[PDB]
Amino acid sequence: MNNPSDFKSFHDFVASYMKTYSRRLEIGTFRHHKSCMRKFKEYCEGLQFHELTEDFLRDYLIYMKKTLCNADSTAQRNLSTIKIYVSAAIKKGYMENDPFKDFGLEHHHHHH
After folding, report:
1. How many domains does the chain have?
2. 33: CB partners within 8 A, 6+ apart
3. CA nearest 78: which of 62, 89, 93, 91?
4. Distance between alpha carbon 75 and the CA centroid of its chain, in Å?
5. What are the angstrom distances between the C-alpha of 30 and each of 27, 58, 109?
6. Do 41 and 89 touch, CB atoms closer than 8 A?
7. Which parts of 1-112 fold into alpha helices (H)?
8. Which residues form a coiled coil (predicted)?
9. Which of 16, 23, 59, 74 is the most exposed place for a label (fewest CB within 10 A)?
10. Measured distance CA(101)–CA(93) in Å, rounded
């Protein structure tokens, strides 16, 4: 196989990079997200580092729970699936911080 980034979209990126995790994952969750990300092309577009925001994760959390109608575990899992490629892009890519760092962890206490 020789395909230098044939994925323009986040859901395609995850589906490809996931191979690094599926080798150390079970098939159950892999196959479940596999079908989702493919038909998820309804919104289209690739979505880059700058389009991936905390508010995006927030809005899509609501969208997935509300409009798609799913459980929190399902939503959090699916969002952390996006978090996978985001985190990859953070670890050895070009992204500095993940959305869930500010979205999930409010510092609360920082000296003063």
Report:
1. 1
2. 14, 18, 77, 78, 81
3. 62
4. 11
5. 5, 23, 38
6. no
7. 10-17, 19-22, 27-39, 54-66, 72-91, 99-103
8. none
9. 23
10. 17
Cα 3 to Cα 7, 9, 16, 42, 75, distances in angstroms? 9, 15, 11, 24, 31
Which single residue is written with the structure tokens 């990126």?
13
The experimental method behind these coordinates is NMR
Residue with tokens 């580092």, as numbered in its chain = 49
The secondary structure of residue 6, as a DSSP letter, is -
CA distances for 50 relative to 2, 13, 65, 100, angstroms: 28, 16, 24, 14
Cβ–Cβ under 8 Å, residues 94 and 49: yes
Q: Which domain holds residue 37?
A: 1-112
Q: Which residues contact 105 (CB under 8 A, 6 or more apart)?
A: none
Quickly tell me which residue has 């996978």 as its tokens.
84
